[PDB]
C-alpha cells in the first residue's frame, strides 16, 4: 500500500 | 498460492510481513523470525505488518508485540479487512504515526477469553491469571491509544466493533488510508 | 428391587431414609420430602439417614442439610460403604452423639469442584462464587467437627480419605458401630 | 420415588407443589394443572410451591407466573437448595409476606439467554424479541421486589448469586426460614 | 405427572379441559381430535376448554384439530398460557368467537409455513406449489378469524412476528386478555 | 394419552372407531386387522369407522388392512382427518361406497410406490419386476374404487399429486366432504 | 395396542396365535408356548396361526414348525399381508386343506442367508452347514407342497414373489380366502 | 491443476487474478497480495479479476474491495459461472465500464448472514453489528449500481437471482460478453 | 499419474483438455483457464475436449459452456466412457461436425437436481430459479440437437440413457468414432 | 515407489502400461492418455498392458476398451495375480494371440453390480440400463472368447473363478506364460 | 526415508536388492513385480536379493510376486529379517534353492488362508470352494519347495504355526540360517 | 525438519549416525536395517552410532534391527538420549560391548512383552505359547548382554521397571553414563 | 364425527 | 381458569 | 377370518 | 415446612 | 442397625 | 476473455 | 484420437 | 515379461 | 547382507 | 556426542 | 535478538 507502506 | 517466488516470499523481499490468520504459536514464531531477519538485513528501513486477523493466543500475540518494540526499524501496521482481539492490539502496537486501516476495515476490541475446570483453588489461580493478563493488555492499550485505563476497561467489557474512522478517533490507528 | 412393599418403602415406614446414590436435585427433592413427611407423622421420634454416596451437587446437598436442621426430630446418620464429598458433609450434619460409621466404611473430604468458561469477568464471578461456597462448607464443617477453619482448609485441599476410626477422631462422626 | 401414594402425590394432597427441576413446557403444564386443581378443591386455603430449580424456558415460567397471579389462593414460595434464573423469578412471584428461603439456599438472577441464526433481518427480529422479553421480566421483578427497573437491569447484567439473607434484603423473599 | 385422589390431565378432561401443551405432531393431533369427539359424545351443548402452550408443529396435524373444532357442536374456548406459536397461534385464533383468551404475559407468534424439497426441478415445483397453496389457505382462514385483510396477514406473517396478549387482542387473534 | 372415567383409543374402539393415525408398518397393520375382526365378531351388521391421519408406509401392511376390510361383512366407513398420503389414501379409497369422507382442510396425496435394490443385475431385475407388478395391482384397484381409467391413474400417480378434499371427491377417492 | 384384555390376549382366548413380526428366538418361544397351552386346554379344537412376517431365524422357525407337527390339534394358517422366507415355510406347514391367504397377500420363497469368516476350514464347515440347512428346508417344502425337491431348488435360487393365486397353484396354500 | 508454470501463475503473468472459490481470509490475503504486486509491476495497465464464487466472509470481501479501490490500475471484473453474495458485491466493485459477465452466468444478491448465541446484551451487539454491515454494503451497492438505497434494501431482502442481462439492467455490470 | 511432464500436461501441449471428473468450481476454473490459454497460444487451431464425466454443478458447467462459445478456436468434443447430465450438455456444445463418441460410450440426459428448505417464500424462489435453469438448458439443447423444446422436455423428464449411435441419431453428437 | 524415473514411468518408456488397481474414472483417464501417447510416439510397435485388478466401474472400463480397439498398435494383455470383473473383460480385449496369464493368476467373471432407489418408474429405468449394460458386455465377451452369448450369461450368473489354464480353454486368453 | 550422498531403498535397488517390508497388497505386488522385471532387463544373469519383513497379505498379490520370481532368469535370493508370516513365508520359501536365508532371531509363521463370505447358501458355497482350491494350490507348491508331503503341510498349517529360523531350515522353508 | 547448508538426519547419516527416535514398527526397522547395511558397504571397519529415543514397539521389528547389528562387521555404539523403553532398551543393550551409553537424565525401562489373543481355547493356547517363547528369547539375550542371570531378568521384567542412567549402568544395560 | 361416522 | 373457562 | 379360521 | 408452609 | 439406629 | 479482458 | 481429434 | 511382452 | 546376498 | 560417539 | 543473542 504505497505510498507510504511502502 | 500463486508464483510470481511464492507471493508472500516476494512481499517479504520488500519488508512486508503478512499477519493474515488466527494467532497461534506457529504464526507468532514465523512473524518473530521475519521481524528479526528484516532487522538483520537493514536496521534502519521500515517494516510493514499487514493485518487481517481475528486474533488468537495472547502469549503468541505478546511474542510479536515484544519483538516489534525490541527491534530498531519502525514497524508500520495496516489493517485490511479485520483486526479483532489480539489482532487489534497488534494494530495499535505499530510505530506512532504509521498505524493505518483501509476505509471499510473492521476493528474489534474486547476482554480476554479462557476457561477453568477443577478444584476451587485451581479456578482461583486461573481467574487471577486471566485478570492479571487483562490488566496488562489494558495498561499497554492505554499507553498506545492515549485513553485512560478506566475507559479501556469499560469499552472492552463486551465486544466493541469500530469502523476505521472510529479506530482513528479512539487512537488505535493514526490515519484512514483513503483512495 | 425385592418386595417384602418395595424394601425401601418398608424401611421408610420405620423412619429410615436411604441416601444411596449420587446427590442430584431429584435425590434431594425426594429426601427433603421424606424428612418433612416423617416429621408430620411424628415430630419427636428419631429419623435414620443411611449414607452410601460419592456426593454430588452442593446445592442439592444443602437442601438436605437445611431440612435436617429445620425439622424437630433428631436425624441419626450412618455411613455404610462410602461417604465422600457432600456425602461426608451430610454424615457430619446428623444429630450430635448420633453420627455413626461401620468399621470398614470410607469417608472422604475435599474442596468443591466446578468450572468456568468465557470472558475474564465471567471467570471472576464463577471463581468468587465457588470460593464463597467453599468458605460456607468449611465454616459449617468447623462447627460440626470442632476443628478450626484453618485446619479444615488444609485437610480438604486435596482428596483426604479417612477410616471410620479416623473420622471419629476428626469429629465427623461420634461412634464407630462395632459388631 | 418412595411410596407412603407416591410421596409427591401425598404432598399434593396437602396443597404442596414441587418445582424441583429445570422448567420446560411439561413441567409448566403440570404445575399449572396442579394450581388450578387445588383452587377448584378450595379457593381460600394457601398453596405451597417448593422451589429447587436452575430455571429454564421463560415462556414456560410465565405460564406458571400468570397462573399463580390468576388464582384466588395465596401461593407461598419456599426456596430449598437453589432458585436460579426463571426459578428465582417464580420465588419472587409468591404471595407478599409468604416468600421464604432456607438459610443456605442459593438464589441467582441474570439476563435471559438465547440464540439467532440466519439473515440480518431475522437476527434483528430475534434480538428485538429477547430484549422485549428482558424488559417484561425486569418490569415484573421491579413490581415484586420494590427495586427500580434500572437497578434490576444493572444487577442482572451478569450472573449474580445471592445468599438467602441477601435475597431478603433485595426483596425477592420476605423471610429467611430459621430452625 | 402427579396423581390426584387419576393422572392430572385425565382429571382435567373430566371437566372438559383439553391440554395442547407440546409440539403438534400426528400423535398429539390424533389424541386431541379423539378427546374433542369424546367430549361432544358426552355432551353436545357444554363448552370445551382448549388450553394452549405450544410452539406449533405439523400443519396437517394442526388442520385435523382445526377441522374437528369447527365440526363439533360445542363451543371450544381457547386459552393461551405461556406460548402459542405458528400452528399453536392458528388454533388459538380458531376458538369460538368471544371465547378466545390469553394470560397477560403469554406470547403469541405468527409466521409463514416452513418446509423442504429435494430432487428434480419438477419435484421442487410440486413441493413449492403445495406449500404456497397451504399458506394461502392458512392466511385466508386467519383473515376470517381476525377480521384483518389477507394482504395485511400476508405482510405480518412474512417473518416471525411476536405479539403480546394485548397486541393479539388488538389484532383479533383473541377476544380478551384474562386479567387477575 | 389420557384416560376417560379406558385409554381414549380403547374407548373409541368400544363405539367401533379404529384409529389409523401413524405410519403403516406391520405392527400397525396387525393391530388394525385384529380390531376389524374383533368388531365383526361383536356385530357383523353394524358399521365400522376407520379414521385416517397417515403418511402411508408399507404396501404389504396396507394390503393386510385392505383385504381385511373387503373380507368382513360390516361396511367400513373411512374418514380422512389431516392427511391421507400414499397407502393412506389407498385405504381411504377402500372404504364402503357412499361412506368415504374427508374433513374440509384434509390433504390427500397419491403417487407411485417407492423402493430400493442393490446387488447383481439379475437381483435388480427381480426387485424392479416386483415393484412394477405392485404398482399395476394398486392402480387396477384404484381404477375400480374411483371409476377413473387405469391410464389416467398411471399418469396422475407418476409424481406426488396433492388433492384438496373437494378434489378427492371429484376424483372419486371419497364420496363426500364432511362440512360443519 | 388397544384394550377390549389386550387385543392379542383376547384373540388367544379364541385359539388365534399372531405371527406378526420377524422370527427370532423370543417370538418362537412365545408361539411354541401358546401352541402347547392351547393343546392342553383342548386337544381336538383347531388352532389358527395368522401370519404377517418377513421371516427370520431358521432354527426359531423350526421350533415353531416342529411344535405344529407335534401337537394333536390342526393348525390352520392364514397369510395376511406378507409371508416371506421362514414365514412362507410356516404358512405351508399348516394342516392340509386349512392353509389360506387373502387375495392381495404376498408370499416369497428363497434360499437361506448367512455368513462365515475365518480360516478356509471354518468357511468349509459354515458352507456345509448352510447347504445341509437348505436341503432340510427344501425336502420339507417338497412334502408340504407336492413339488419335487429339484423344482423347489430351482424356484428358490433367487427371491421368488408369488401372488395368493400362484401360492395356491404351487401348493403352499390350499385356498385363496375370497370376499 | 495442469502445468504449461501452474496455469493460475501463468495467468497472473498477464495480470489475471482468479477468485474461483469461497471467500475466506486466506483467499482475501492472496488476492490482496496479487493486486498490490501487479500495481508495483505496472501502475497504469488494467488488472482482470475473474469471479466464480458463492461469496463468503464479508470482512475478507472488504479487504479485496478496499484494495481494488486503493490501487491506481483499473480492475476489470468478469463473472464466469456464478457470483453470489460477496462475490456479486466484488463483481459490482470493478472499474466503471469494465464489469462483465458471460451470458449464462448467475448473479445473486441477498442480505448478510450470521449468528449469535448467549445473553440478550450479546445478541443485541451481534444484531447491531450485522445491521451496520448491511447498511455499509447497501450504501456502496447504491453508489456502484445507481439504484436507491431503498430499492437495494427491498431487492436484497431474500435471495435474488439475476441473469447476466438482468445484472446489466440493474447496474451490477456494464456489459454482457456475447459470443 | 505417470510421467512421460505429467501425462495431462503433455496432452495440453497438443491442445487436449481432459474433463475426466465430476464438474465442480475447481474443475470449471481449470478448464476455463486452459481454454483461454490455448486460445492465446493459437487462436485458429482446434482444441480437443475429452469427456468422461458424470456431470455436476450447473453453474460450473455453464462457465465451461460459455467459454467454449466465446473463444475463436473450434472445440471438438469426444465422449470416452460416460457423459452424463452437465457432461452430456458439454458434449453437445462442441463445434458442429466435430462432436464424437467412442462406440461403447454412454450418454445420459435428465433434468437438473436441487434442494430447498425454509419458509414458503424461500421455497418459491428456489423453485422459480431451478425451473428457469431447466428452461435455459432445454432451449440450448434444442438449438444444439435440432430437436424441439417439447421433445427435449419429455426426453429429460427422467434419466434417459443413450448409446453412442442413439446420441448421434438424437443430434447430441455428429459421429461415432469407429476403429 | 522406488526410483531407478519412478519405476512405472520407466516401464512406460518401454510401452508397458500398469493396470494395477481398482478401475475408476481417474485410472481410466490415465490409461487412455497413456495409450494415445504411445500411439503418437509409434503407431506400429506393440503396447503391453499388465493387469492386476479386481475391476471397478464399467463405463471407466469401456473407456479403456474402446481406446484399445481404436489405436493402431496391438495391445498385449498379461494377467499377473488377479483379473476380476471389468479386469477380466480388459484381459480378454487384448490383441488376438497376445493375451497371456501367469500360471497362478486368478481370473474371475460375473455379472455387473449396481443399485436403484426411488419410484417404481426410476427403478425400472435403472434396471433396464444395467440389463442393457450386461447384454453389451456379454456380446463383446462372446466375440472375444468365441463362446455363445447364452453360455456367457449362464457362466457369469454368479462369481466364477478360473485358473489361467481354464481362462485359456474358455478363450479369455491365448496362452499361459510358463517359466 | 533418509537420503544417502538417492532415497535409501532406491540406492539398494541399484545393487539389485528389493525390499518386501510391509503387508502384501496389490500396490506392493505391482511395485515388486516391476522391480524384478527391471532388474532382469538390466542383467539377466546376476542374482537379485529379496529381503522379507512382512506379515503377509493378499494371496493373489503374493502369487503375482511368486510367478514373477519363477518366470525371470536371475536367481532370486530370499532373506527373512524380523518376520515372514503367511504369504510372507510362502515367498521366503519361493527363493532360489540353496539361496533362502533367515537371520537367527527371525520369526517364520505358516497357516491356512483367511477369508469371508456373506449372502445366499449358493454364494457361500462358491466362496468356500474358491478358498479351499486356493489352499490346495498353496499347499502343493509348499510341498514342492520344502520337500514335505502335502499331508504334512495340511496338518502343520491347520492353525498358526510359528517356527524359529533353525526350525524353518529343518522344515525346508529356508536353506541356511545366516549366522554372525 | 531443518536444512543445513541436506535435511539434518541425512547430514548425520553422512557421519554414520543413525537416529532411532520413534516407536518401532516395520517401516522404522526396514529403514534402520537399510542404513546399517549401507554404512557397512561404505566402510566395514568404522564405527556406527545408533542414537535411541524410543518407547519401543514391535518385537519382530526390533529383532530385525538387533540381528542386523550383530551381523555387520562395524561396531555399533548405542546412546540413549531421553528414553529407551521396552524394545528400545533391548536395542540399547545390543550395542558393542564398552560402547553403550546414556545421558545422565535419560530414562531406561524394561518389562515383559505385551500382546493379545481371542478365539477358541486351542487358539489362545497357541498365542500364549508363542508370546512365552518370545519372552524366553528376549530374556536369554538380555542375560547374555547384561551379565545378569535369567532368573533375575525374569523377576525384574515382571512389571514395568524404570531405571536411571546410573542404574542402567549398574544393571549392565549400558557401559557408561556420558557426563558433561 | 356423528352423524353419521357414527 | 374459572370463571369462565370453566 | 370366520367362517372357517374360526 | 410447618409452621407456616403448611 | 438396631440398637440404636433404630 | 480478449478483447478486452485482456 | 487422430485423425482427426487430433 | 520378454520374450515376448516385450 | 554380504557375503553372499550380495 | 563426541568424543567418542563420534 | 542482538545485541547479544546474537
mmCIF file of N, CA and C in Angstrom, chain I residues 89-130:
data_model
loop_
_atom_site.group_PDB
_atom_site.id
_atom_site.type_symbol
_atom_site.label_atom_id
_atom_site.label_comp_id
_atom_site.label_asym_id
_atom_site.label_seq_id
_atom_site.Cartn_x
_atom_site.Cartn_y
_atom_site.Cartn_z
ATOM 1 N N UNK I 89 -24.386 -32.281 -21.752
ATOM 2 C CA UNK I 89 -24.626 -30.924 -22.212
ATOM 3 C C UNK I 89 -23.352 -30.354 -22.866
ATOM 4 N N UNK I 90 -22.198 -30.581 -22.232
ATOM 5 C CA UNK I 90 -20.922 -30.069 -22.756
ATOM 6 C C UNK I 90 -20.495 -30.841 -24.013
ATOM 7 N N UNK I 91 -20.774 -32.147 -24.055
ATOM 8 C CA UNK I 91 -20.521 -32.948 -25.245
ATOM 9 C C UNK I 91 -21.267 -32.341 -26.453
ATOM 10 N N UNK I 92 -22.536 -31.985 -26.243
ATOM 11 C CA UNK I 92 -23.403 -31.420 -27.289
ATOM 12 C C UNK I 92 -22.971 -30.006 -27.682
ATOM 13 N N UNK I 93 -22.153 -29.352 -26.841
ATOM 14 C CA UNK I 93 -21.726 -27.957 -27.023
ATOM 15 C C UNK I 93 -20.484 -27.831 -27.921
ATOM 16 N N UNK I 94 -19.871 -28.941 -28.324
ATOM 17 C CA UNK I 94 -18.695 -28.909 -29.203
ATOM 18 C C UNK I 94 -19.030 -28.339 -30.579
ATOM 19 N N UNK I 95 -17.986 -28.014 -31.346
ATOM 20 C CA UNK I 95 -18.183 -27.399 -32.672
ATOM 21 C C UNK I 95 -18.997 -28.352 -33.548
ATOM 22 N N UNK I 96 -19.923 -27.787 -34.322
ATOM 23 C CA UNK I 96 -20.832 -28.574 -35.160
ATOM 24 C C UNK I 96 -19.998 -29.355 -36.171
ATOM 25 N N UNK I 97 -20.278 -30.652 -36.302
ATOM 26 C CA UNK I 97 -19.494 -31.537 -37.153
ATOM 27 C C UNK I 97 -18.308 -32.170 -36.439
ATOM 28 N N UNK I 98 -17.996 -31.737 -35.212
ATOM 29 C CA UNK I 98 -16.787 -32.210 -34.509
ATOM 30 C C UNK I 98 -17.121 -32.692 -33.082
ATOM 31 N N UNK I 99 -18.302 -33.290 -32.920
ATOM 32 C CA UNK I 99 -18.728 -33.904 -31.662
ATOM 33 C C UNK I 99 -18.768 -35.419 -31.875
ATOM 34 N N UNK I 100 -17.995 -36.148 -31.068
ATOM 35 C CA UNK I 100 -17.772 -37.571 -31.250
ATOM 36 C C UNK I 100 -18.055 -38.338 -29.952
ATOM 37 N N UNK I 101 -18.320 -39.640 -30.103
ATOM 38 C CA UNK I 101 -18.291 -40.590 -29.001
ATOM 39 C C UNK I 101 -17.682 -41.905 -29.491
ATOM 40 N N UNK I 102 -16.963 -42.598 -28.604
ATOM 41 C CA UNK I 102 -16.487 -43.940 -28.883
ATOM 42 C C UNK I 102 -17.679 -44.899 -28.835
ATOM 43 N N UNK I 103 -17.593 -46.072 -29.502
ATOM 44 C CA UNK I 103 -18.772 -46.898 -29.766
ATOM 45 C C UNK I 103 -19.548 -47.360 -28.524
ATOM 46 N N UNK I 104 -18.839 -47.599 -27.421
ATOM 47 C CA UNK I 104 -19.419 -48.180 -26.231
ATOM 48 C C UNK I 104 -19.643 -47.115 -25.150
ATOM 49 N N UNK I 105 -19.423 -45.846 -25.490
ATOM 50 C CA UNK I 105 -19.651 -44.744 -24.577
ATOM 51 C C UNK I 105 -21.145 -44.610 -24.256
ATOM 52 N N UNK I 106 -21.416 -44.130 -23.040
ATOM 53 C CA UNK I 106 -22.759 -43.944 -22.501
ATOM 54 C C UNK I 106 -23.016 -42.444 -22.382
ATOM 55 N N UNK I 107 -24.143 -41.995 -22.932
ATOM 56 C CA UNK I 107 -24.588 -40.630 -22.788
ATOM 57 C C UNK I 107 -25.894 -40.660 -21.992
ATOM 58 N N UNK I 108 -26.035 -39.755 -21.021
ATOM 59 C CA UNK I 108 -27.268 -39.686 -20.263
ATOM 60 C C UNK I 108 -27.707 -38.232 -20.118
ATOM 61 N N UNK I 109 -28.997 -37.992 -20.360
ATOM 62 C CA UNK I 109 -29.615 -36.679 -20.206
ATOM 63 C C UNK I 109 -30.760 -36.801 -19.190
ATOM 64 N N UNK I 110 -30.998 -35.738 -18.423
ATOM 65 C CA UNK I 110 -32.065 -35.675 -17.445
ATOM 66 C C UNK I 110 -32.281 -34.207 -17.035
ATOM 67 N N UNK I 111 -33.197 -33.954 -16.096
ATOM 68 C CA UNK I 111 -33.474 -32.597 -15.663
ATOM 69 C C UNK I 111 -32.546 -32.257 -14.498
ATOM 70 N N UNK I 112 -32.292 -30.954 -14.247
ATOM 71 C CA UNK I 112 -31.469 -30.522 -13.121
ATOM 72 C C UNK I 112 -32.018 -30.947 -11.752
ATOM 73 N N UNK I 113 -31.093 -31.136 -10.808
ATOM 74 C CA UNK I 113 -31.367 -31.571 -9.458
ATOM 75 C C UNK I 113 -31.050 -30.424 -8.506
ATOM 76 N N UNK I 114 -31.786 -30.348 -7.393
ATOM 77 C CA UNK I 114 -31.524 -29.338 -6.387
ATOM 78 C C UNK I 114 -32.292 -29.594 -5.107
ATOM 79 N N UNK I 115 -32.350 -28.553 -4.284
ATOM 80 C CA UNK I 115 -32.982 -28.623 -2.996
ATOM 81 C C UNK I 115 -33.355 -27.246 -2.494
ATOM 82 N N UNK I 116 -34.222 -27.234 -1.486
ATOM 83 C CA UNK I 116 -34.703 -26.031 -0.857
ATOM 84 C C UNK I 116 -35.338 -26.401 0.490
ATOM 85 N N UNK I 117 -35.014 -25.609 1.515
ATOM 86 C CA UNK I 117 -35.518 -25.707 2.863
ATOM 87 C C UNK I 117 -35.843 -24.286 3.347
ATOM 88 N N UNK I 118 -36.887 -24.147 4.171
ATOM 89 C CA UNK I 118 -37.208 -22.903 4.868
ATOM 90 C C UNK I 118 -38.656 -22.473 4.667
ATOM 91 N N UNK I 119 -38.857 -21.157 4.595
ATOM 92 C CA UNK I 119 -40.179 -20.567 4.502
ATOM 93 C C UNK I 119 -40.736 -20.812 3.093
ATOM 94 N N UNK I 120 -42.066 -20.792 2.991
ATOM 95 C CA UNK I 120 -42.782 -20.951 1.725
ATOM 96 C C UNK I 120 -42.175 -20.048 0.637
ATOM 97 N N UNK I 121 -41.939 -18.778 0.986
ATOM 98 C CA UNK I 121 -41.373 -17.755 0.085
ATOM 99 C C UNK I 121 -39.983 -18.176 -0.434
ATOM 100 N N UNK I 122 -39.154 -18.766 0.439
ATOM 101 C CA UNK I 122 -37.815 -19.210 0.077
ATOM 102 C C UNK I 122 -37.895 -20.410 -0.868
ATOM 103 N N UNK I 123 -38.858 -21.300 -0.638
ATOM 104 C CA UNK I 123 -39.018 -22.482 -1.477
ATOM 105 C C UNK I 123 -39.478 -22.046 -2.874
ATOM 106 N N UNK I 124 -40.339 -21.028 -2.916
ATOM 107 C CA UNK I 124 -40.842 -20.454 -4.156
ATOM 108 C C UNK I 124 -39.670 -19.906 -4.993
ATOM 109 N N UNK I 125 -38.779 -19.131 -4.349
ATOM 110 C CA UNK I 125 -37.617 -18.556 -5.023
ATOM 111 C C UNK I 125 -36.730 -19.671 -5.597
ATOM 112 N N UNK I 126 -36.445 -20.696 -4.782
ATOM 113 C CA UNK I 126 -35.612 -21.824 -5.214
ATOM 114 C C UNK I 126 -36.252 -22.558 -6.400
ATOM 115 N N UNK I 127 -37.572 -22.775 -6.333
ATOM 116 C CA UNK I 127 -38.297 -23.476 -7.393
ATOM 117 C C UNK I 127 -38.245 -22.682 -8.709
ATOM 118 N N UNK I 128 -38.531 -21.375 -8.626
ATOM 119 C CA UNK I 128 -38.511 -20.485 -9.794
ATOM 120 C C UNK I 128 -37.112 -20.522 -10.441
ATOM 121 N N UNK I 129 -36.067 -20.470 -9.601
ATOM 122 C CA UNK I 129 -34.707 -20.484 -10.095
ATOM 123 C C UNK I 129 -34.377 -21.800 -10.840
ATOM 124 N N UNK I 130 -34.707 -22.954 -10.242
ATOM 125 C CA UNK I 130 -34.340 -24.226 -10.877
ATOM 126 C C UNK I 130 -35.193 -24.452 -12.140
#
